Design an enzyme around this catalytic site. Structure first.
Site, PDB file in Angstrom:
ATOM      1  CE1 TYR A 139      -4.145   1.853   0.556  1.00  0.00           C
ATOM      2  CE2 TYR A 139      -2.848   3.136   2.119  1.00  0.00           C
ATOM      3  CZ  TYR A 139      -3.995   2.975   1.364  1.00  0.00           C
ATOM      4  OH  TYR A 139      -4.985   3.933   1.456  1.00  0.00           O
ATOM      5  CG  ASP A 166     -13.971   3.202  -6.407  1.00  0.00           C
ATOM      6  OD1 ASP A 166     -14.231   3.943  -5.435  1.00  0.00           O
ATOM      7  OD2 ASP A 166     -12.850   2.662  -6.565  1.00  0.00           O
ATOM      8  CG  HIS A 201     -12.619   2.261  -2.794  1.00  0.00           C
ATOM      9  ND1 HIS A 201     -11.836   2.640  -3.863  1.00  0.00           N
ATOM     10  CD2 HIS A 201     -11.782   2.157  -1.733  1.00  0.00           C
ATOM     11  CE1 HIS A 201     -10.581   2.764  -3.466  1.00  0.00           C
ATOM     12  NE2 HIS A 201     -10.522   2.477  -2.178  1.00  0.00           N
ATOM     13  CB  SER A 208      -6.974   2.637  -2.773  1.00  0.00           C
ATOM     14  OG  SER A 208      -7.558   3.951  -2.628  1.00  0.00           O
TER      15      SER A 208
HETATM   16  O1  LIG Z   1      -8.498 -11.473  -4.456  1.00  0.00           O
HETATM   17  C1  LIG Z   1      -7.414 -11.659  -3.935  1.00  0.00           C
HETATM   18  C2  LIG Z   1      -6.299 -10.684  -4.222  1.00  0.00           C
HETATM   19  C3  LIG Z   1      -5.067 -11.371  -4.882  1.00  0.00           C
HETATM   20  C4  LIG Z   1      -4.016 -11.480  -3.738  1.00  0.00           C
HETATM   21  C5  LIG Z   1      -4.444 -10.437  -2.685  1.00  0.00           C
HETATM   22  N1  LIG Z   1      -5.817  -9.984  -2.989  1.00  0.00           N
HETATM   23  C6  LIG Z   1      -6.541  -9.063  -2.270  1.00  0.00           C
HETATM   24  O2  LIG Z   1      -7.673  -8.775  -2.625  1.00  0.00           O
HETATM   25  C7  LIG Z   1      -5.962  -8.374  -1.043  1.00  0.00           C
HETATM   26  C8  LIG Z   1      -6.229  -9.152   0.261  1.00  0.00           C
HETATM   27  C9  LIG Z   1      -7.443  -8.394   0.871  1.00  0.00           C
HETATM   28  C10 LIG Z   1      -7.141  -6.927   0.463  1.00  0.00           C
HETATM   29  N2  LIG Z   1      -6.544  -7.010  -0.887  1.00  0.00           N
HETATM   30  C11 LIG Z   1      -6.538  -5.997  -1.826  1.00  0.00           C
HETATM   31  O3  LIG Z   1      -6.012  -6.179  -2.922  1.00  0.00           O
HETATM   32  O4  LIG Z   1      -7.112  -4.795  -1.550  1.00  0.00           O
HETATM   33  C12 LIG Z   1      -7.114  -3.732  -2.544  1.00  0.00           C
HETATM   34  C13 LIG Z   1      -7.787  -2.503  -1.998  1.00  0.00           C
HETATM   35  C14 LIG Z   1      -7.141  -1.732  -0.998  1.00  0.00           C
HETATM   36  C15 LIG Z   1      -7.767  -0.573  -0.488  1.00  0.00           C
HETATM   37  C16 LIG Z   1      -9.037  -0.185  -0.977  1.00  0.00           C
HETATM   38  C17 LIG Z   1      -9.680  -0.952  -1.973  1.00  0.00           C
HETATM   39  C18 LIG Z   1      -9.054  -2.115  -2.486  1.00  0.00           C
END
Ligand SMILES: O=C[C@@H]1CCCN1C(=O)[C@@H]1CCCN1C(=O)OCc1ccccc1
Length: 682
Positions: free
Chosen positions: A452, A616, A651, A532
């Protein structure tokens, strides 16, 4: 393959004499027929590409199956009923149940009944002091906008018509008279992209119309702020109003409710520090703050003369970041030790009662309750440990297991280790690497590097069914605690803001290098993920170093760094990014890394799957539309440049389980397929 044709316009913007061409400017219009047709074509091409992956279905099947287990939240009392969230396993949204003595548990508020595909979600829930009236906010299609509904708890029927135009709002009751909330005002144009910056605090009195709600803060010029919040203390003695223009730094005001028409007194009048209310005891306010304390501290001050010069430490600042929760007449200090938690129990006089031992190394949640709660509940989890609930007896410190996880994942089957690597400038950065036991550091493991990096956001151990399924497939999951984050206090955050932003991308790049050097993976087995701000991260690294990874997955990312601030409440991120209108130096710096403006014709980019959503309004979709059109336009190598636009979703928060499952299935399939796998790893 064959991407949908994307016409290029003649739009050209100027920044300090510098001309910049923006051919996909029309894609910023989220209400035009052309854009809608474009999104449809794009999703069409993506689904057709994905349809070519043999094991896509097996992966989705696996995800849904391992996700399908009963989940239950901790109970909380309100009247003669204890309330608790539950999910049979694959319910699109969690259901709020309640139960009274001598009767079987009953469904109280079931969000699933509000929408066909469960795209309507419950955000805030706030019971009146007596627990007879419930105010709760709902999100439609994943948007940041909200409606506050009012239900008579006893009969579970609507009390009043819902309050509209709510956003980024709390719900804080003043006894049983009514509550304070925040609102903007429907902008002229799309409420999913148009700028909003005059947030206001209103007080809705029960038994009155919303048009008659008193305006409490934010209307006169001197109080105009992009973000305002309101909280009334548990004992109904003080109203606390916060006002801010960015995501970091806020002014704070207090009104003594025990007196007739008391004036607002200033607890903090500048935006130089964050300060928030924890609780009060008599006329003393307890505030968490980073003022003069980079890792934060808890101070106290008499509400009748609350100025910063008068604050006095209750829990002095330490080398680790402090966060404070209150419950049962105690203050619970949570510290961050290299991204993992530690908890200490203190009384309101600052005397330390004890150190609360946690299940292991990971993240804790909870230790939040009313002054009168006889017991507190906390959750523990990490990358290889599903959420576990514990009940804490405050006076004796007794801890007992409340809810073991029903997830089909054996924690002893995985490894989640912390490593520290070094960035370009020498800075030591933490990296937590998780995977299934028995992995061999031979540089062949499919890997996903996540980051991040910004907004004082900390990436602490968090459990995910998706990630656990990736570990089962043999993949490695690595999370870097990049600068820009809040892991090591304000200094860590600021080392990654504005004209220091590149430090964050350098840390990510260096994490990728460490993983290969240490033998966890290799380039054609490496993918980078981010959302994000983490989406900007992926976007920036893939455009600066397209040689570094095989797969790139930017989610709902801020990709046009030159215009980002012109949308919704993007300006609220100026503290972290700075804007193209600040100065030529800031403009140049932003133009220097802006993903959209650093995609170059002839360059071979990795296989990419840009993900976003049509609702979003945090990060308008246009960012990803333009980034994706540019990549499809400029890429030269053989790798696909795709974009997956989720429908009736925003979002992120409140996304239906069915959509989360399809999303991960698509991403995991695309990733392994782009790494050359023709059959699931093994
Ligand atoms: O679907 C699984 C994907 C591939 C590997 C990590 N992934 C994730 O989705 C991970 C773990 C949970 C948060 N995450 C993520 O990518 O969050 C993105 C995000 C962050 C902040 C605001 C909105 C979206």
């Amino acid at each position: 393959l064959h991407y949908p044709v994307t016409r290029q316009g003649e739009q050209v913007d100027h920044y300090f004499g510098q001309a910049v061409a923006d051919p996909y400017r029309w894609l910023e219009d989220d209400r035009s027929p052309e854009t809608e047709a474009w999104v449809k074509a794009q999703n069409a091409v993506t689904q057709d590409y994905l349809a070519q992956i043999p094991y896509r279905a097996a992966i989705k099947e696996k995800l849904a199956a391992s996700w399908n287990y009963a989940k239950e939240g901790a109970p909380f009392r309100e009247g003669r009923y204890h309330y608790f969230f539950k999910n049979d396993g694959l319910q699109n949204q969690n259901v709020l149940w309640r139960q009274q003595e001598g009767k079987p548990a009953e469904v109280f508020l079931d969000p699933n009944t509000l929408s066909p595909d469960g795209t309507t979600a419950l955000d805030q829930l706030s019971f009146s002091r007596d627990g007879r009236i419930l105010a709760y906010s709902l999100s439609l299609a994943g948007s940041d906008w909200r409606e506050i509904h009012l239900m008579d708890v006893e009969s579970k029927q609507p009390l009043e018509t819902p309050l509209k135009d709510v956003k980024f709002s709390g719900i804080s009751w003043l006894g049983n008279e009514g509550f304070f909330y925040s609102s903007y005002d429907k902008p002229d144009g799309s409420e999913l992209s148009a700028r909003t910056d005059q947030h206001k605090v209103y007080f809705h009195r029960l038994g009155t119309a919303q048009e008659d709600d008193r305006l409490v803060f934010g209307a006169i010029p001197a109080q105009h702020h992009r973000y305002v919040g309101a909280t009334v203390t548990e004992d109904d003695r003080f109203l606390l109003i916060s006002a801010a223009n960015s995501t970091s730094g806020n002014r704070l005001y207090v009104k003594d409710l025990s007196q007739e028409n008391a004036p607002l007194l200033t607890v903090q009048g500048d935006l130089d520090a964050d300060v928030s209310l924890v609780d009060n005891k008599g006329s003393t306010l307890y505030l968490l703050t980073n003022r003069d304390a980079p890792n934060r501290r808890l101070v106290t001050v008499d509400a009748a003369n609350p100025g910063p010069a008068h604050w006095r430490d209750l829990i002095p600042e330490r080398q680790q970041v402090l966060t404070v929760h209150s419950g049962s007449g105690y203050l619970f200090a949570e510290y961050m030790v290299d991204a993992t938690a530690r908890v200490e129990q203190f009384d309101y006089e600052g005397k330390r009662v004890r150190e609360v031992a946690l299940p292991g190394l990971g993240s804790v949640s909870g230790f939040n309750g009313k002054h009168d709660d006889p017991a507190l509940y906390f959750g523990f989890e990490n990358y290889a440990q599903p959420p576990t609930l514990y009940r804490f007896e405050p006076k004796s410190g007794a801890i007992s297991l409340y809810r073991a996880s029903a997830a089909p994942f054996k924690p002893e089957d995985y490894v989640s280790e912390q490593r520290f690597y070094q960035s370009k400038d020498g800075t030591r950065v933490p990296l937590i690497i998780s995977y299934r036991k028995g992995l061999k550091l031979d540089g062949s493991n499919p890997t996903i590097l996540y980051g991040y990096g910004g907004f004082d956001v900390s990436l602490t151990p968090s459990f995910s069914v998706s990630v656990a399924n990736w570990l089962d497939l043999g993949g490695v999951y690595a999370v870097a605690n990049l600068r820009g984050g809040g892991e090591y206090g304000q200094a860590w955050h600021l080392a990654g803001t504005q004209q220091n932003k590149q430090n964050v991308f350098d840390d990510f790049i260096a994490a990728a290098e460490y993983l290969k050097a240490e033998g966890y993976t290799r380039t054609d087995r490496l993918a980078i993920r981010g959302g994000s701000n983490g989406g900007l991260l992926v976007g920036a690294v893939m455009t600066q170093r397209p040689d570094l990874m095989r797969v790139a997955l930017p989610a709902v990312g801020v990709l046009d760094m030159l215009r980002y601030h012109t949308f919704t409440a993007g300006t609220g991120w100026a503290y972290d990014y700075g804007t193209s209108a600040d100065s030529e130096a800031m403009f140049d710096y932003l133009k220097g890394y802006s993903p959209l403006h650093n995609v170059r014709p002839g360059v071979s980019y990795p296989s990419t799957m840009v993900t976003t959503a049509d609702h979003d309004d945090r990060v308008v979709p246009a960012h990803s539309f333009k980034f994706a059109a540019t990549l499809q336009a400029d890429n030269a190598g053989p790798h696909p440049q795709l974009i997956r636009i989720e429908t009736n979703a925003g979002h992120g928060a409140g996304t239906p389980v069915a959509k989360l499952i399809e999303q991960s299935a698509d991403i995991y399939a695309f990733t392994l397929y782009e790494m050359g796998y023709r059959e699931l790893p093994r």
